[PDB]
């Protein structure tokens with residue numbers, strides 16, 4: 080009936096302290112659904128792990144190159160290559176290497192990810208492992224993997240609409256989806272947005288769980304979000320990593336920009352960071 | 358005698374970030390400001406929200422909810438004392454300066470956590486008082502950021518895309534949301550490839566700016582009065598205001614682009 084997805088691995092990263100939370104419920108739902116379709120599922124429950132989110136010298140267990148002028152980016156890359164990274168970092172890196180699908184489950188906090196997840200990015204997404212300056216965006220190491228955000232908010236969807244007090248949600252997601260995930264190569268799927276979960280009745284919450292589960296059955300066949308391909312740009316320091324001139328000329332006449340970040344002073348394509356286009 | 362709080366998020370005293378903090382403190386003191394600091398790494402500050410932040414009796418320990426529990430604790434005064442000490446510095450401060458390196462297109466984890474544990478409901482925001490009506494409307498804030506990448510990379514045509522979009526969640530979502538008037542950010546691009554003689558010039562320029570910082574015009578955000586501030590209306594833009602804007606070519610701000618063009622450098626330069 081569905082002899083598929085049998086070879087495939089999934090990592091679920093959760094950033095909530097309480098097992099009584101709807102965030103925890105969504106993580107359980109995701110794991111169940113994926114297992115049922117024959118995925119292997121690994122988890123990182125950052126609060127349960129008591130994960131340490133602060134970068135420091137202690138992340139390098141070997142010999143620093145220049146302890147007088149300590150620079151986390153350079154020192155962390157050397158340590159990755161020589162294998163004297165702190166073992167909590169390495170364990171997470173091995174889960175990522177193995178995973179084909181990565182799901183991030185968290186509550187929106189101050190228009191962003193929780194501190195503990197931010198720190199996970201900071202300590203685990205090391206140079207050479209997750210990105211290089213030669214291989215950015217679509218050429219990056221994780222180009223064979225897919226990622227998706229599943230977010231809960233306290234505020235209602237109207238508040239994050241084009242005319243809402245808080246403003247467009249597409250703008251809020253951009254730094255995360257483009258700046259962190261796509262930067263390392265991930266194909267980014269449509270975010271799962273659960274608005275105003277605190278004022279949602281029980282019957283509706285169950286529908287949401289059921290809908291999440293249903294989505295996950297075919298998650299791998301979805302079309303990803305649109306980001307400008309790197310090939311539109313001159314990727315060297317002399318050109319300034321600017322958009323190629325021929326591409327500027329092709330776009331001179333169009334009404335819409337390419338993406339939220341590449342709006343080009345024009346209109347932002349509707350729901351660029353929320354819905355795929357095919 | 359006005360008061361200033363400088364929040365720093367860098368671990369190394371050898372860093373240009375540390376240099377900029379020292380420069381800021383010197384300049385402000387010279388002009389007769391009182392200067393308080395939060396060096397988050399030096400303080401070994403704890404950035405993770407937990408039950409431990411409430412020292413008293415939880416309202417509902419079976420179904421723990423940080424937003425509700427933190428607000429009760431603020432009102433009854435059983436917040437963890439590390440949180441309270443920071444809150445007292447904020448209350449006193451007229452000017453707040455945030456000094457940090459851009460990390461993953463955002464603030465460092467340790468500063469994010471500072472926001473999460475210190476900007477508690479009732480203290481920093483309510484629901485009645487959002488944005489320009491918020492508790493900190495009498496105070497001014499400014500970001501001072503360093504990046505490794507060059508400014509061309511964050512231009513309209515750069516690989517990384519518009520810097521105005523990157524700053525919006527911080528300046529609007531965190532700072533303006535609580536009432537702060539937000540001043541033009543101090544952006545130091547490609548600090549890694551800047552020599553010592555140039556860095557000292559930059560420090561000197563930072564210092565020069567700070568002598569008149571209080572007289573500057575703040576960034577533009579859509580006033581709250583353009584909106585229907587109740588749950589039934591959905592906090593949407595009022596109909597009359599939608600009609601007045603229907604024909605204009607530019608939107609109001611980065612977040613309130615309204616499907617039109619974003620006013621140039623909305624989050625970087627004042628009017």
Ligand SMILES: Cc1cc2nc3c(=O)[nH]c(=O)nc-3n(C[C@H](O)[C@H](O)[C@H](O)COP(=O)(O)OP(=O)(O)OC[C@H]3O[C@@H](n4cnc5c(N)ncnc54)[C@H](O)[C@@H]3O)c2cc1C
Pocket residue numbers: 095099100101102103104186187188189190191231232233234235276277281284285420422423424473474
């Ligand atoms: C520091 C901070 C910053 C914040 N910033 C923002 C912000 O910028 N924007 C914003 O919109 N919000 C913000 N919030 C609010 C926050 O995003 C919400 O509290 C969060 O999304 C709630 O998710 P939860 O899983 O914790 O819900 P809970 O309140 O724990 O759960 C919601 C409801 O679902 C019920 N439930 C749990 N499990 C199940 C189940 N299996 N089946 C059915 N019902 C179930 C619960 O019992 C409860 O009734 C912020 C909160 C904090 C603490």
Ligand SMILES: Cc1cc2nc3c(=O)[nH]c(=O)nc-3n(C[C@H](O)[C@H](O)[C@H](O)COP(=O)(O)OP(=O)(O)OC[C@H]3O[C@@H](n4cnc5c(N)ncnc54)[C@H](O)[C@@H]3O)c2cc1C
Pocket residue numbers: 148150151152200201202367371372373374375376458459460461462463503504505506548549553554556557
């Ligand atoms: C996890 C992580 C994520 C990152 N993500 C991004 C990203 O998304 N985008 C981005 O653009 N960058 C990113 N970076 C890079 C980061 O922003 C830069 O490395 C940072 O801005 C460097 O600033 P610094 O103060 O540490 O100075 P450094 O350049 O690291 O070192 C300071 C130098 O200044 C010198 N100096 C100090 N004081 C003085 C003085 N008074 N006079 C003269 N010289 C002085 C010191 O001697 C030293 O040589 C990231 C880095 C990390 C670790």
Ligand SMILES: NC(=O)c1ccc[n+]([C@@H]2O[C@H](COP(=O)([O-])OP(=O)(O)OC[C@H]3O[C@@H](n4cnc5c(N)ncnc54)[C@H](O)[C@@H]3O)[C@@H](O)[C@H]2O)c1
Pocket residue numbers: 189190232233234235277424425429530534
């Ligand atoms: N933008 C931000 O930075 C930010 C940060 C935090 C929260 N928020 C806001 O959080 C809201 C989500 O709803 P909420 O978390 O405020 O819900 P809430 O806590 O106000 O839920 C209210 C319900 O809980 C009941 N209740 C009983 N005792 C209570 C108590 N001690 N405290 C609170 N409620 C009690 C009320 O009677 C009512 O039924 C959104 O409006 C969102 O904007 C925004």
Ligand SMILES: NC(=O)c1ccc[n+]([C@@H]2O[C@H](COP(=O)([O-])OP(=O)(O)OC[C@H]3O[C@@H](n4cnc5c(N)ncnc54)[C@H](O)[C@@H]3O)[C@@H](O)[C@H]2O)c1
Pocket residue numbers: 212316505506507510517547548549550551
């Ligand atoms: N996260 C990011 O966005 C990002 C991206 C790329 C690189 N980085 C980091 O920062 C570094 C990027 O380099 P950078 O931007 O600091 O400097 P750079 O290496 O690009 O400096 C350019 C060099 O050419 C010269 N030069 C600079 N501008 C010029 C111009 N307009 N015309 C002619 N010559 C010019 C300079 O004197 C310098 O020697 C990388 O080494 C990496 O560590 C971060």
